[PDB]
Design a protein around this ligand. Structure first.
Ligand SMILES: O=[N+]([O-])/N=C1\NCCN1Cc1ccc(Cl)nc1
Ligand SMILES: O=[N+]([O-])/N=C1\NCCN1Cc1ccc(Cl)nc1
Ligand SMILES: O=[N+]([O-])/N=C1\NCCN1Cc1ccc(Cl)nc1
Ligand SMILES: O=[N+]([O-])/N=C1\NCCN1Cc1ccc(Cl)nc1
Ligand SMILES: O=[N+]([O-])/N=C1\NCCN1Cc1ccc(Cl)nc1
Lengths: 209, 208, 208, 208, 208
């Protein structure tokens, strides 16, 4: 029976923040899911939007695993003590402003969960934001330097409440949110990079009828 | 015969800033209490507020205790040399801007006290801010990754003037501040995260 | 008997930045004085001002003294190598923006001087700024975690012209500056905290 | 064999981030190509633009190479663990804002690849941005401290769509982009610094 | 023969970043010359100007010199591995924004050169900026903690095109620039601090 102090200790040794946990030669399965929390600055003229969302990220790193039959099977670890996916938002025009503590959750089986609350600005289609159908902003997130053979991002598509955690005090209301998996290759190079395309459909609230 | 130099050296030798000081399977009891110092910006249309407040935070970490019968029973320590609760404002739309030196106070009995002055923007109910009844902005502060079995958060509900340290130079005034213990559970997982619900009742000054 | 490289070497070998240089058991005498350089942005509606000033900070650290009979009696040192008072502006609404190199001047007798140029925004009485009597903005600076028995702050009773280094290109002009010593206590805790209350009376330049 | 960890451990072990990987006294062949992703702020009065581009930079560091006959031939590495060309946008008026993970790609032959997405503001000709001819903003990128003998910069001449990865939601559109190799020289010294002069022909998307 | 790696290492193992490289008692002779590259945010009401310039800074450290008969006679070295003059713009109202790689240049003879391109806001005379005579903004740069005995600054007095590198796309133009040597003392202290007073005479471009 070991305590949390040891669990972190053994992790800080078997872990490599800059080494992708590629088991055998299969890519790392990275699950990416966003939970829109608020929509703030929207400019239909420039087509830019400021969003706040919880980026639920999940992946596995066996090396971290440990016996929890008589010990804690989950601990909070600083992301800098672990390896994390170099995920990026392709159409982002500002760097992610992480608002919460940068701690990840690690389970004795190696499963890793990281869910930061992020404030970021995007360049997307904002036209129709002040119309009934609303506007649909597409966010593309995926690894930046790890192609499909190294990292495979897949959205945890599961019928959930889109505006479930959305601020009721927002000026906008969520009409719908669909998250589709996609892949991007580049004419120069053979490898392709997987990504998740999150489509955010929203409109202004209190519009005349 | 110990001194401040030694008290610190010891904390360095025993403190595990990245490991929650959990005794047995008993969650670390964290006490949180906000003290509104100022309200800088308020948007009646976007329901957003920019405020300044002291966030009094307390918890125990016996592994840092020491005999103070022959030396100071308290010293200032950089929070980076100590474990700190990963508290967060669930409804904050900006990262916390700490305006004060990031030092905590550690008492010979292991008691830890951290009270930084913070400026932060939040998303809450601003309606009625211009009336006599004022608005009620509710702020939720609780652990971000540690649940009830690991961390517990209870407000320091006592008697004092809600606006006892509030700038008299603000455009607003505090009518009342109430802080209650709350809980947050997410649809996916049974685990629950304790938090403190801070309700700020304020209105614009000079209710014409 | 030595060079500047030796002096600095010893300082790093004996100095402990996270330990206040308490001599015996008496509080560390920290002297604080502000020499206003500019008044940039002002808002009489929100009662906020942006200010640039030199925060002349002084105190003593005996654990750094050295024989200078045949060696330099003074050297510039990175504040990150020395212990520095955890001063703060109580009514500041933005963290201090240090504009100058963060080097302190250490004397062979243990005297330490740190005078950074700082730009910071404060919440204070800006009313009457466009009048003849002008406005009086009071700035309060004192230790954040060290109470009176650990740190005492007092203004340098040295005389000098207030708008001496004040930019003549500022839209405003300094009418007077009084730096009073003060103490604060909190209904929760016995210990009190010292601070220097700097009242800056200024106004928008008129004409004729 | 040699898993990714062995390679990364080796690179970390042999990498000299502060030394230029000069084969003989041949300068280092650095290639840079900009992929304009968006044009955000544009001011024809001040001749200032805010652009987002992927600055594809490539060079070689033979000392990093390793045998990949039965091991990974490419890995992602933090640029902090590698030497990087000290490129600068001569006509930039803001420090480069890297929006992506600062990781490069290292190939078993020593080929280093780094392609950050950068948002930056430049001072260039903006006049005509509203006409059909559009405006022609020219950006000059090159080493800042290393001249032609130490570092050479050549554009990856490869006919591809200029606005291939240009946001369709931008108020502007790309007319044509030319990345010509150029050079610079300062009146003082003979040393000439190689650069890449990128001419961006863009205009505001009219009503369509 | 020595490669760049051996040169750097010798430098690193003998440079003292926090120790002023004094020779005997004499002061370290630092040369400061500014090359205005652009003028941006200008305000005659607030008397503030935004300016971009190259701050060519030169000094020597003979302890770093080496034999370059058959080895590189110059190398680029990170300013963090070397001691750098703690220069500061006395009338700057914003911290300096360094737009370029923070790399210095060390010559085999001990000469050290550092020329960062800096963007920074200043408080100076802006009156008449829209007149024919234009305006004259005076920038004062010089050591912050080192007095005349430890550091001395000499303006690079040499006939050269003032707007040689000045942006043509700027909304303003340089009428003339003068870099004189100045000295400063404070009623408290006998020592003086040398500096270089740069007087930029510019105006708003027009058509005639
Ligand atoms: O399951 N959840 O939705 N959890 C959740 N939403 C907001 C905060 N939170 C708890 C949590 C759980 C795990 C990690 Cl790594 N961070 C945060
Ligand atoms: O109890 N208090 O309200 N204390 C208090 N308010 C402003 C400054 N201050 C002193 C203090 C006490 C303890 C810590 Cl960790 N930080 C600061
Ligand atoms: O005595 N002074 O007023 N000194 C002073 N005013 C502006 C700059 N300066 C020099 C100085 C002296 C000592 C230190 Cl630690 N920093 C700066
Ligand atoms: O060739 N590309 O255009 N590649 C590319 N564009 C966006 C992301 N990406 C992949 C990539 C691969 C390697 C490096 Cl060092 N940077 C980026
Ligand atoms: O004017 N110059 O001699 N050189 C120069 N101007 C802008 C860039 N540059 C090259 C250079 C030369 C030396 C150093 Cl330390 N940095 C940069």
């Amino acid at each position: 029976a070991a305590d949390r102090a040891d669990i972190l200790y053994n992790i800080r040794q078997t872990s490599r923040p800059d080494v992708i946990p590629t088991q055998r030669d299969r890519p790392v399965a990275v699950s990416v899911s966003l939970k829109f929390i608020n929509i703030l600055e929207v400019n239909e003229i420039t087509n830019e939007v400021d969003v706040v969302f919880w980026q639920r990220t999940t992946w596995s790193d066996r090396t971290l695993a440990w016996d929890s039959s008589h010990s804690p099977d989950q601990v909070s670890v600083p992301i800098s003590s672990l390896w994390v996916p170099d995920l990026a938002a392709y159409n982002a025009i500002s760097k992610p402003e992480v608002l919460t503590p940068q701690l990840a959750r690690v389970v004795s089986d190696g499963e890793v969960l990281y869910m930061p609350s992020i404030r970021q600005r995007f360049s997307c289609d904002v036209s129709g934001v002040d119309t009934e159908s609303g506007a649909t902003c597409r966010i593309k997130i995926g690894s930046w330097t790890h192609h499909s053979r190294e990292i495979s991002v897949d959205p945890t598509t599961e019928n959930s409440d889109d505006s479930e955690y959305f601020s009721q005090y927002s000026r906008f209301e969520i009409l719908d949110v669909t998250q589709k998996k996609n892949s991007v290759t580049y004419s120069c190079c053979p490898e392709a990079y997987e990504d998740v395309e999150v489509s955010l459909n929203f409109r202004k609230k209190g519009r005349s009828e």
